[PDB]
Write a protein that binds this ligand. Structure first.
Ligand SMILES: O=c1[nH]c(-c2ccc(C(F)(F)F)cc2)nc2ccccc12
Ligand SMILES: [Zn+2]
Lengths: 47, 161
């Protein structure tokens, strides 16, 4: 795994082109996330 | 030590997690290539993941970050899609769950859009799609995502396409 940028704990990827996209985030230590919900689903064919 | 507790669809927790899943679908610039073509999901099950050791490992680190950032963990709830969701829920996140080739370097990636994490369920770029039909847009096979508690602390802002 890489390291966080010095003096930071994560990276935020801000969308700068696709006006409808939300943010994506990166962490470099596994201990910074807890997998709280497991969601089982199907994607639905549009009508 | 992991146990999985089913939430009832009548439970307010089931309902708020389902709503974050459905409301954060968007269209993707690949036209559905990686993740499939859909505007919404059929939610089949939501389970709470309970592991004391993994929780304490998270809260320990959360306090360290918080004390380095004026007592602000900057905690979010975010989606993660991965072929290794079964290993994650039992052993926790580690270096083996990193996206070595991601645009912000080798780290563990999370999304506010559920539909962005859906693109990684069967691998990077959707891999070859579902194991059974080799279809990245399979409407039959069961998929899983994680909705995760993530400590961001002081986050480096990368403007990006
Ligand atoms: O949920 C995500 N998973 C992944 C993701 C990437 C790679 C791998 C693995 F290499 F298969 F371990 C597993 C999950 N990448 C993302 C990138 C941006 C936003 C969300 C995600
Ligand atoms: Zn399938």
């Amino acid at each position: 795994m890489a390291h966080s940028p010095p003096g930071h704990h994560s990276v935020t990827g801000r969308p700068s082109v696709n006006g409808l996209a939300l943010a994506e985030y990166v962490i470099y230590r596994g201990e910074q996330a807890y997998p709280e919900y497991l969601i089982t689903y199907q994607i639905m064919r549009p009508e | 030590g992991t146990i999985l507790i089913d939430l009832s669809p009548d439970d307010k927790e089931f309902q708020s997690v389902e709503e974050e899943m459905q409301s954060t679908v968007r269209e993707h610039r690949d036209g559905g290539h990686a993740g499939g073509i859909f505007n919404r999901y059929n939610i089949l099950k939501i389970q709470k993941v309970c592991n004391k050791k993994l929780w304490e490992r998270y809260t320990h680190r959360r306090k360290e970050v918080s004390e380095e950032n004026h007592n602000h963990a900057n905690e979010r709830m975010l989606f993660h899609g991965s072929p290794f969701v079964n290993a994650i829920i039992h052993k926790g996140f580690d270096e083996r769950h990193a996206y070595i080739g991601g645009m912000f370097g080798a780290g563990i990636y999370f999304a506010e859009n559920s539909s962005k994490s859906n693109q990684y369920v069967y691998g990077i770029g959707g891999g070859t799609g579902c194991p059974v039909h080799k279809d990245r847009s399979c409407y039959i096979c069961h998929r899983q995502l994680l909705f995760c508690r993530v400590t961001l602390g002081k986050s480096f802002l990368q403007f990006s396409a």
